[PDB]
Design a protein around this ligand. Structure first.
Ligand code: CA
Length: 258
């Protein structure tokens, strides 16, 4: 027996979050939740949706987040998506930062869809990223912030892909054929974080690619309850819209009942 809560009213907003419909671009969707709309190239912008219930890493879970990326090159667009687990909260994230850059909240960890060429970790041509500038190309990976806040790449590269680089994600294209069957990252697509307590492993699925990390890789203490944040950010000194969207009705947190 499992239970599923959906986003809708089970998330609290922190920082640069608005909820509105996009009837021209997403006519089948209802109210979408948008990060980074509050343009300011002085400061950049960030936001986090904090799940109102705790995550228990002694029990299985599956978290599904529909995301739609900015149709924007990796030097001008948003940093990406940080699916963070932390004993800290959204307020801390606004004050200390997240998992999408080189430094954020101490001990925060989780899965990132990195959609920006901005940091030394982005520099890894073998594993992560070799197309820079106009390319709507990024990469996925688990990351852990250390005790010092520094973000490290952890866990496995993508399983059984032939892509080069192995962690590559083409996070957007200009397609008008949204229901091609091909992956179109600017449309809504599920990120699935499956956690198997028996193997202490989170599997992340996005764009038909799979990553895994253990709780040990993420520095997660299974005895402690964690908060779950969906985060995005857009750098200072980026003159673009870096708008990153989710459908909070499509956000599902499934756990065993006990
Ligand atoms: Ca990056």
């Amino acid at each position: 027996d499992t239970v599923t809560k959906k986003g809708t009213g089970n998330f609290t907003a922190h920082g640069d979050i608005i909820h509105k419909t996009y009837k021209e671009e997403f006519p089948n969707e209802g109210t979408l939740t948008a990060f980074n709309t509050n343009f300011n190239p002085n400061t950049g912008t960030k936001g986090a949706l904090e799940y109102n219930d705790k995550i228990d890493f002694n029990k299985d879970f599956t978290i599904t987040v529909p995301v739609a990326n900015n149709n924007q090159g990796n030097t001008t667009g948003a940093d990406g998506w940080g699916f963070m687990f932390t004993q800290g909260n959204g307020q801390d994230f606004l004050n200390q930062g997240g998992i999408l850059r080189d430094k954020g909240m101490a001990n925060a960890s989780g899965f990132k869809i990195d959609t920006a060429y901005n940091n030394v970790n982005d520099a890894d041509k073998t594993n992560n990223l070799s197309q820079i500038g106009a390319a709507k190309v990024g990469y996925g990976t688990f990351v852990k912030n250390g005790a010092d806040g520094v973000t490290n790449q952890v866990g496995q590269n993508a399983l059984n892909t032939k892509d080069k680089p192995v962690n590559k994600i083409i996070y957007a294209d200009n397609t008008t054929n949204h229901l091609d069957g091909q992956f179109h990252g600017q449309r809504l697509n599920d990120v699935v974080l499956n956690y198997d307590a028996a193997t202490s492993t989170i599997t992340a699925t996005y764009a038909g690619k799979t990553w895994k990390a253990t709780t040990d890789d993420l520095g997660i203490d299974k005895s402690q309850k964690y908060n779950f944040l969906i985060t995005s950010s857009h750098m200072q000194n980026r003159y673009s819209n870096g708008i990153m969207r989710t459908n909070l009705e499509g956000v599902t947190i499934t756990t065993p009942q006990a």
